[PDB]
Every structure is written in C-alpha cells, then in structure tokens.
C-alpha cells in the first residue's frame, strides 16, 4: 500500500506526450497507474524509446529487456539504439521526466540514491546522468527507513548529483524543493501534519494551500 | 578471411589483455567468446563493460573464474561475487557513470582527447578529475578509454563483415567496435552482401577484424 | 500534431535567429523551408551548416539574398557570393574544421560541455582556443554550438515523427536534430507507424517538434 | 601526363582491403589506375564507405554524391552515415590512407593545402581532420608551381596540420618524410637526380637505395 500510494501520486504528475524514464524498483510501479487519457513514452538506459509492459508468456524476445534485464515489449514507433545515444537523450535535456528511488534527500534538494558505504555498493549505473540531465526529477521513496527520516538537513550518504530535484513524493508527503528550502505541498489523507513534521528531520516550509492527496 | 574458428581467441586474447566486452546485463554479450576464454583460463584481464552481469552469465562468468584483475564498469550490484572480490581486495573496481563510460569509450573510438561532462560533478566521481568551467558551469574532464580487443555481439554480419544489431542488445557494442585496436564480433547469422542496406548497417566491416560463428 | 503547413515557417523562424540547417553542398538540405525563408525575407540570420552550398541552391540562396549576418561552416569555396560578402565585411564567416563542427554540434545535442580534438592544433584554428595536454598530446578544447532552430531534411517520417534518412543526404541532419531548441524536419513522405522499424530509425519522433510536407 | 604519372605511382602504394579517401582533383585520378588485383574501399567525407564510380546516365540518385556533390554509385556492402560518424572514422584512425593535393610540403613533413592568403579562401572542410587522423597521408602534387619549388624548408602558407605526412609523390620524385628530414626514394625515369634537387628548396637526403619509377 505505501508503495502504491507513492506510485499513484507520482503517476498524476505525468503529462501527455512526455518522455519518461522510470528507475528500477518502486518508480516502475508508476507505470501501472497512468490515467487512461495520458499517453507518455518510456525510455530505458539499455537503449529504447517506446518501452512497453512485460510480454505475455511465449512473446518474449531475448534481445528486448528493461534496465534490469527483465523481458519487455516494444510499442509501435519504438526506437532502439546504442548506449551513447541513450545518454545523449538523458544528458542533453531530451528526457522530460525521470522518476528515481531515494535513500536521502536534503534541504538543498540533493539526492543520495546509489551507495550506502560499508553495506551496499552496486555502482551508480545511469543514476547520476539521469539526475543531472532530466528536465524534471521526481524522487519516489518511503518517508523513513524503519523510523529514521530520509528527508534530512544535509545528506550523509554519497550524492548522486548536486542538481536540485524538482519533487519528492512519499507515502506521507509531497515536497517541492525551492530556493528557500523544502516546500511541503500536500500530505496523505491517512497522516497528519504533526506526524509528517515529527518524521522529517529537514526544515519544511509549509504551503498556504496545503492539500490532502498523497 | 574475417570469419575464424572460436579456437583463434587464444591467439588473439592475450594473458593480461585489456578488453572491451559488449552487453547490458548479459544482453547482447559475446557468450561464446567468453566461454572460450574461460576454457583456456585467460586471466589478469582488465574488462571494460557496462556491468559484470550475473554470476552465471556473460561477463559474470569471467569474474566467477577470477580471470579479471580489474573491471571498469558502471554497475556491479547484480553480481554478488564481483562485490565479494572487490571487498577482499583481489579485484580492482573502477565505477564510471554509465553515460560517461559511453562517451569515454566513444572518445577513443572517434579520436578525441577527452570530453567535458556535468555528470558526476560534486560527487565522488569528481576525485582526481580536472574540472573545467565553461560559461560559468563546471564540467569534469573525462578521458578516452582504450583497449587491446573489443569482444562484441551482433545479430547479423554480411560477407564483408558489416554488422547490424537487434533491439536492446545493441547498447555498448558499436561503440566498443570503434575504440579497441582489434575487434572480434560474435554474430548469430552470416548473410549475403546486399542483405544489409547501406541505410541500416551500424558497424562497417572495415573495422571488424574477426568474426566468430 | 507535428505536421504543419510550410506557410507556417514565417511564424517559427524569426528575424535574427540562430539556425542549424542540414545538408552537404545542398544534398539533404530542406530546400522548401529555405524557399519559405526567402519568400518572407527572414533576415539577419546566423546559419550553422557544413557549407554555403552554391549560389543557386540550398543555403546558398540565403546568402544570395543577403539574409545571413553570419555563417559558421567548414567550407565556402563553391559559393563565390559567400566569399564576396565575406571580403566586403557584410557577412561574418567563422570557419570550422568539418569534424570539429560535427562534434561541437553533437556536444550541445548530448549535453557535453566540450570536446578535445587534435584537429587544428598548430594551425590558425588554435587561435583563441584553450589548449589541453593529455598524455603529452595537445588538444584544442572545442565548445558546444547551440541554436534556436534546427532546419533538417529527412527521407520519411512515420505518424509519430520518427525519421529515417537516405544515403549521403544524412550528413549533419540527425546531429542538428539533437542540438537545437526547436526542430523542424522537411520530409519527402509520411508513412504509417510500423513502416520504420526500431532497428532502423535514426531520429526519434520525441525530438522532432514540427514536420513539413 | 604529369598528373597521370603521379596518379599511377600513388595507385601502386595502395594495398588490398584498405579504406581509402581521395581528395578532390588530382588525387581522384588515382582511382583510374588501381591494379586489377587490388580491391580497396573508398570513403567520402559527406558520409559513405563503399563509394563507386559515377553512374551511367539515368542511374543517378539525388541523395548519393561524392564530397563535391557529383553523383556517385554505391557498391554492394556500402554503408552511409552521419557526419559525426564520418569524422569518427577519419579522426579516429580507421582510415588506412588519404591521398590529398598540395600547395607546399616542408622538411618537417608538414602540409599546407587549404588556403592561399589574399587569393583563395575556400575554408578547410575535412582536410585538417584527414591529415591529422589518416593512418597514412600521401601528398599528390606537381613538383613546382610554374617553376617555384613547392617542397620547401618551412611552409609559408597556412598549415593544414602539424602531422608529418608519410609520402610525397610528384611527377619527378617520391619522398618519404622521416625523423632526419626528407628522404628521396625514387625519381622519374624522365628526369635526373640533379633536376630533382635543383627544383626542391628543401634539403633532400638521397637514398642509397635510389630507384627509377615515378
Ligand atoms: Cl505481449
Ligand atoms: Cl551503374
Ligand atoms: Cl644527375
Ligand atoms: Mg499541527
Ligand atoms: Mg521536524
Ligand atoms: Mg582494427
């Protein structure tokens, strides 16, 4: 449910005709909740524009996967390409949105999402290129790590990028980083403002128009 | 005389070679070349690739057999044995942002001395990089990556060695083809010249030195 | 919808625009778009292109009609009117080695801050360039070239705006498509989605803003 | 005849299966003199590997030209490509041989071949990339300009490149630049060693090996 809560609210941010890259894991659930009237185009780092859902059994192709090597389909009008062209789309500003997972986000909007020193070293993959390059970065992450706030004053985990992310969506809150700090825009119907504040170590500016939603 | 038996790997891939190997998590990877390398236990390799795939597949099999001294990759998280060897100190790992890796390999392929990229600025990737400011903005100078042999995978070759790729098996393969000194392409099918149109070929035969299967 | 009438050019290309225009000596150039610009005397243009073609064709027609304040090209030798206006001082000409022009445009398209190239070192091209030494070899630092509008030519587009090119008409067109803010593609045919395979498309429709005929 | 003499001798330098780029003008005559047992592949800057001769009347294609926009054919197994890929072949050391024309060559092996100040300003085109990147550069040029030596001590015309070319072929001489200076390896059957030296302002090292030929 908390992961569904995040994916549904993130999906509402997507606009018709956008090129969108969903990180592996939680962000991928976003594809299950696009409104019927919104057609977007999905891009994957392994080299495809026009990614589609997993194939029905028997319809797999060994050469056609997502960035986790799981089998996908390609939609009509898809284009496949080499990895330099892939990161030219990403680093060169042609990707409208990327939704990425998160370990921490801080008061400057900096995301840490690729390494936990001493515990988990998978490498960064495309993450630093995507955060640096996407026209809009949305972080999709559970609000805490078994109680520890993940929205902190200054990241203690290694940064993915010094780029300021455009939106944070958790199961409790929607926060927009701004030049003044983190602007809390919305809170979950199932939480309270006092709980969000108790569970957020970073300073939050509170919007005049705070909405309920996700 | 580009097409050769797989046994010729042993004359072409030396002990301690620096190799570029195509494939994204094992998709579009030259599995048969890899198996021959393992067969003759060709070791102390430096492998430039997107990742170390998985323990039972592609480049991951090289690591399982400890044939690698160093890997230059963007991702190792799907291969616990790569991580284990990294922590024990037996395997040197250099982690490169995937887009920077693509452009550093490409720089070698097309004769550039380096490329400036904003990716990695202000992260650990900045360590031991020259930083260059252009119109107020900071970029990391990232440098060409070279290799002795590119071991690439392609879908088809015509008689002249022109290659085409298939869907997301393309990834780093055509880039590596341009960057290494010698290029060995594992292909699924040999087709007559004239089957691959001038408009669809992606790697010209002139840069492919050897073909297997 | 991407496809628009050619008469709309006068609404998308402004006086004093910085334009990338595709084509190699008029081959693969958007001849109909250029004719619209001439019809409506859209002037004071800065044109980035391989060349100024010939007096009677392609980009040459823009120079004939004195619509360019500046050209950034690798070659002008086939257009005596470009040379005339250069000598008189009416037209500013920035000459760029053709391979550097390709990579400077590409660099803007893929989001690089610059590239280092050995081309032009120790020639007049070195003037006003930062020189960078890598492994004892000298490179010129060449900087990304941006533009307001790319005016490109392609053979076909599908309903989604995916483009393919034809033989030596490709040249600079797909590179300029990535580099400019707004991209307008003149195409010869509109074909159904599914006519252009994912393995053969060279410019994805996502980066094409407008298509004419 | 002198242009024939040069083209024929340059053609003998080519080896089977090489990728070759011929510059506009004198070097393009080389193609007419390739031995029948030597198959090479021609590259053109505007984006083709596998160029062939001009088409018979009626077989022209508007999209298939050489670097002077003249109609060409494409041979079986040709590949066409964009200008970035084209100059990646050239600058990246994938071009086995380029044969270019010449205004001056000097004792350092430096070529000037793209501009004459105060007269011809055509721009450089691909000439700087080709001289810098070709595995082997052959300069094909008349020995003098109306009697004035073009093989000089130091170029006075603008350099195309600081790269040391690998061979100079005139109607009188075959000269190989080396670490010690210019090595005269052959002379025309129709001339004399004294005439060659008289018509070269640069210091020439005469080979013990000296041959007649072109
Ligand atoms: Cl399906
Ligand atoms: Cl014919
Ligand atoms: Cl004599
Ligand atoms: Mg309260
Ligand atoms: Mg608080
Ligand atoms: Mg080779």
Author numbering:
A (entry chain B), D (entry chain C): 2 to 215
B (entry chain A), C (entry chain D): 1 to 213
Provide the publication's sentences verbatim.
CtfAB then transfers the CoA from acetoacetyl-CoA to acetate to reform an acetyl-CoA and produce acetoacetate. CtfAB is a member of family 1 CoA transferases. CtfB contains the acetyl-CoA binding site and the PS01724 signature sequence which includes the catalytic glutamate residue (E46) sandwiched between two short antiparallel beta strands on the N-terminal end of an eight-stranded mixed beta sheet. CtfA contains the acetate binding site and the PS01723 signature sequence.
Based on previous reports, mutation of the catalytic residue on the beta subunit (residue 46) from a glutamate to aspartate (βE46D) should convert the CoA transferase into a CoA hydrolase. Here, creation of the E46D mutant in the B subunit converted the transferase into a hydrolase, with activity confirmed on acetoacetyl-CoA. Evaluation using the in vitro acetone pathway assay at 70°C showed that, in contrast with the WT enzyme, activity of the E46D mutant did not require acetate; acetone formation was the same at 150 mM or 0 mM potassium acetate (0.2–0.3 mM produced from 5 mM acetyl-CoA). In other CtfAB, mutation of the catalytic glutamate to aspartate creates an enzyme that is unable to form covalent aspartyl adducts but is competent for hydrolase activity. A proposed mechanism for the hydrolase activity involves the aspartate carboxylate acting as a general base to activate a water molecule for nucleophilic attack. The E46D mutant is partially active as a hydrolase but cannot catalyze the CoA transferase reaction. In contrast, the shorter D46 does not reach into the acetate binding pocket and instead is rotated away from the acetate binding pocket and positioned to form a hydrogen bond with the side chain nitrogen of N22. The catalytic glutamate is closer, more flexible, and better positioned for direct attack, whereas the aspartate residue is less flexible and partially fixed further away from the active site by the hydrogen bond with N22 making direct attack unlikely, but E46D could activate a water molecule and position it for nucleophilic attack. Based on previous literature, this is the first structural evidence from substrate bound crystal structures that supports the proposed mechanism for how the E46D mutation converts the CoA transferase into a CoA hydrolase 28. Attempts to convert T. mel CtfAB into a hydrolase (β, E46D mutation) worked but was too promiscuous to be useful for specific use in the acetone production pathway.
